[PDB]
UniProtKB/Swiss-Prot annotation, chain A:
It comes from Mus musculus (Mouse). Residues 8-16 have a biased composition (Basic and acidic residues). The gene is Map4k1. Expressed in hemopoietic cells (at protein level). Ubiquitously expressed in all tissues examined at embryonic stage 16.5 dpc with high levels in lung, heart and fetal liver. In the neonate, expression is restricted to the tissues which undergo lineage decisions, lung, thymus, liver, kidney and brain. In the adult, expression is limited to hemopoietic organs, thymus, bone marrow, and spleen and to the testis. Interacts with MAP3K1. Interacts with FBXW8. Interacts with CLNK (via its SH2 domain). The chain holds residues 465 to 480 of 827 of the full protein. This is Mitogen-activated protein kinase kinase kinase kinase 1. Residues 1-7 have a biased composition (Pro residues). Autophosphorylates: phosphorylation promotes ubiquitination by the Cul7-RING(FBXW8) ubiquitin-protein ligase complex, leading to its degradation by the proteasome. Tyrosine-phosphorylated after activation of hemopoietic cells. It comes from the Eukaryota. Serine/threonine-protein kinase, which plays a role in the response to environmental stress. Appears to act upstream of the JUN N-terminal pathway. Activator of the Hippo signaling pathway which plays a pivotal role in organ size control and tumor suppression by restricting proliferation and promoting apoptosis. MAP4Ks act in parallel to and are partially redundant with STK3/MST2 and STK4/MST2 in the phosphorylation and activation of LATS1/2, and establish MAP4Ks as components of the expanded Hippo pathway. May play a role in hematopoietic lineage decisions and growth regulation. Belongs to the protein kinase superfamily. STE Ser/Thr protein kinase family. STE20 subfamily.
Curated annotation (Swiss-Prot), chain B:
The gene is Grap2. Interacts with phosphorylated LAT and LAX1 upon TCR activation. Interacts with SHB. Interacts with PTPN23. Interacts with phosphorylated LIME1 upon TCR activation. Residues 1-57 form the SH3 domain. This is GRB2-related adaptor protein 2. The lineage of its organism: Eukaryota, Metazoa, Chordata, Craniata, Vertebrata. Coiled coil: none annotated. It comes from Mus musculus. Belongs to the GRB2/sem-5/DRK family.
Amino acid sequence: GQPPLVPPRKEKMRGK
Amino acid sequence: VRWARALYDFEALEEDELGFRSGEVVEVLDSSNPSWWTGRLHNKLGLFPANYVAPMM
């Protein structure tokens, strides 16, 4: 049922 | 990838994030970052989880 996790916010920067 | 459909609601929690509701269609501007894609909705720009959308193609 539950949606997946959001990835770490630090990965918004380049190079994931 | 030019267009993707939201699979889940995403709540923007940072200034650079693009929130959306499930089923909304996002214009995809960058899909090279594997974690966070850059896109547009409501003429608004932001980053959102790649895993929260399904590319339309």
